[PDB]
Amino acid sequence: MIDTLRPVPFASEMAISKTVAWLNEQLELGNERLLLMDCRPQELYESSHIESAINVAIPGIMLRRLQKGNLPVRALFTRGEDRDRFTRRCGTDTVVLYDESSSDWNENTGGESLLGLLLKKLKDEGCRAFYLEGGFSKFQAEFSLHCETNLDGS
Secondary structure: OOOOOOOOOOOOOOEOOOOOOOOOHHHHHHOOOEEEEEEOOOOHHHHHHHOOOOOOOOOHHHHHHOOOOOOOOOOOOOOOHHHHHHHOOOOOEEEOOOOOOOOOOOOOOOOHHHHHHHHHHHOOOOOOOEOOOOOOHHHHHHHEEOOOOOOOOO
């Protein structure tokens, strides 16, 4: 495993919004070793797609497929329920969202205001906080255009 993604290769290339990785270890864990943020309806199944997904508030689950990079700013966060499940299961190990490239953060990687404060707060409490996106064959190789199991499947 990696302590807050310290290495260089995979499981250590997630800054603000690159992708989702953490060896089969984490990908298998999905209990009390991490805290994702995606979907809402089938929070159970969709969570299965990853470790422990959170009930995020999006329009149609980000088009029910992490493949678009467009969803409105703070599309899934500044609402209520989102922070509810998170703050509830916060402090597990690592927090990761699936807003994708250019969506909830608009693709800034610098320190915007909306998501800029949302992330800053998520890390302030004591976390790395990183979302998905689709950069290079690496980040996309991990969670390319998809990131789903009971929403899109194959």
